[PDB]
């Protein structure tokens with residue numbers, strides 16, 4: 278409709294959280310082209326058949342997700358347009374630029390390893406939980422904002438997107454990447470890639486926290502129940518990795534999100550919003 | 552719906568035009584924070600009352616537009632999601648990141664000049680053509696893709712967005728900025744800003760050309776008539792500037808777009824698409 282421009286009259290609120298993360302994003306901008314993968318292909322040929330299978334599996338998980346989160350961001354951006362929160366639109370529009378840049382980096386790392394075949398037999402067949410969330414849950418909750426931009430749908434969207442996918446699932450793979458790169462002294466180019474992607478996820482989960490906490494302070498009693506119901510619905514080895522350890526961290530990250538969610542309760546909207 | 556990921560199976564087409572501009576965008580990335588505005592405020596106090604009025608006017612025009620083009624990009628991105636063109640989604644999602652970064656740079660330049668008042672009395676009252684296009688035309692044609700993602704609406708959208716707004720209107724202000732900064736030796740910080748924004752518009756009009764030419768090669772007979780009807784509907788001093796000269800360039804840029812539009816006619820889809 279464009280009845281009034283928030284940049285001409287009221288201006289930009291530079292002290293807001295989505296704008297301060299918007300500064301750090303362009304302050305710590307990194308180019309995947311500068312990341313050299315010329316030695317990763319040598320370390321790829323020095324790994325066993327099973328270690329290459331699990332590494333290709335977890336890389337296929339992120340690369341599948343980086344594209345999905347880059348195209349499911351559209352209803353959240355359009356919802357913020359209908360909400361008039363241009364500052365959120367400015368970051369959420371960058372918040373996807375780092376996501377699309379992540380999908381490029383993994384595809385760059387895959388093409389650097391001569392990997393020219395299909396990786397769909399990793400996103401569905403080997404782990405159906407990754408099919409349930411990204412093929413069914415994430416498209417349903419995000420694109421529900423297109424037809425219903427209600428606050429309760431925003432909470433259901435952000436929890437299925439910034440809390441579990443980015444704060445729990447994406448971070449668990451980073452800790453999995455932490456024990457693969459540091460213990461074996463392999464994949465320095467992907468290590469530079471992950472350390473730059475994990476740095477982006479720091480601002481990604483930060484705004485996701487700010488968005489969900491903003492809903493638990495504007496509609497605390499109703500948003501919290503939907504944000505927890507959705508978070509309870511989502512939750513329902515080589516390289517020297519223990520299966521009881523990765524599950525411990527992903528449950529430790531799940532516990533790390535329940536704290537920051539309930540932290541928003543009984544908080545004044547002045548303490549987080551403007 | 553997320554029935555199939557274009558990044559897991561078929562992969563990314565790195566040789567396509569939206570991906571090659573996606574490389575240059577992150578290759579020539581510039582941070583508006585590094586641009587120093589400490590001497591622009593000194594040159595602002597050395598301009599007459601009318602020269603400051605026209606400079607603030609044309610700056611208020613871009614800053615108003617940079618926000619509008621950053622929030623009207625959402626239907627075009629969602630249309631490319633429904634079209635499955637993830638490569639276009641990757642650039643169009645960056646293509647807005649440079650736009651939101653432009654809206655920041657102008658607001659940074661305005662805040663650097665102590666300009667703390669409203670600029671709405673420049674986007675509507677002084678020039679109603681800027682009200683007709685950005686308050687009525689651009690929201691209508693872009694958000695018509697949300698309800699109707701037809702090829703004819705894409706042409707009407709891109710012409711009202713990448714052809715006249717970015718290729719003609721935005722470029723005319725750059726040529727206007729060309730005669731203001733070079734003839735008077737003023738505003739070096741904004742000169743660094745414009746030269747970096749005009750460099751971004753090079754990739755912006757390039758993809759806009761690629762998108763509209765792709766429609767004139769996939770549906771040449773129907774898209775061209777709508778792309779021209781819309782382009783004919785859109786078209787319907789201080790600093791040593793001549794009113795007959797800026798109109799000459801904006802008509803020269805209008806003529807520069809009719810050539811590249813009709814250039815797409817009688818061209819094989821193999822010559823531009825994949």
Ligand SMILES: [Fe+3]
Nearest residue numbers: 443477478481
């Ligand atoms: Fe993220």
Ligand SMILES: [Fe+3]
Nearest residue numbers: 717751752755
């Ligand atoms: Fe542009």
Ligand SMILES: [Mn+3]
Nearest residue numbers: 343376379478
């Ligand atoms: Mn990511």
Ligand SMILES: [Mn+3]
Nearest residue numbers: 617650653752
């Ligand atoms: Mn621009």
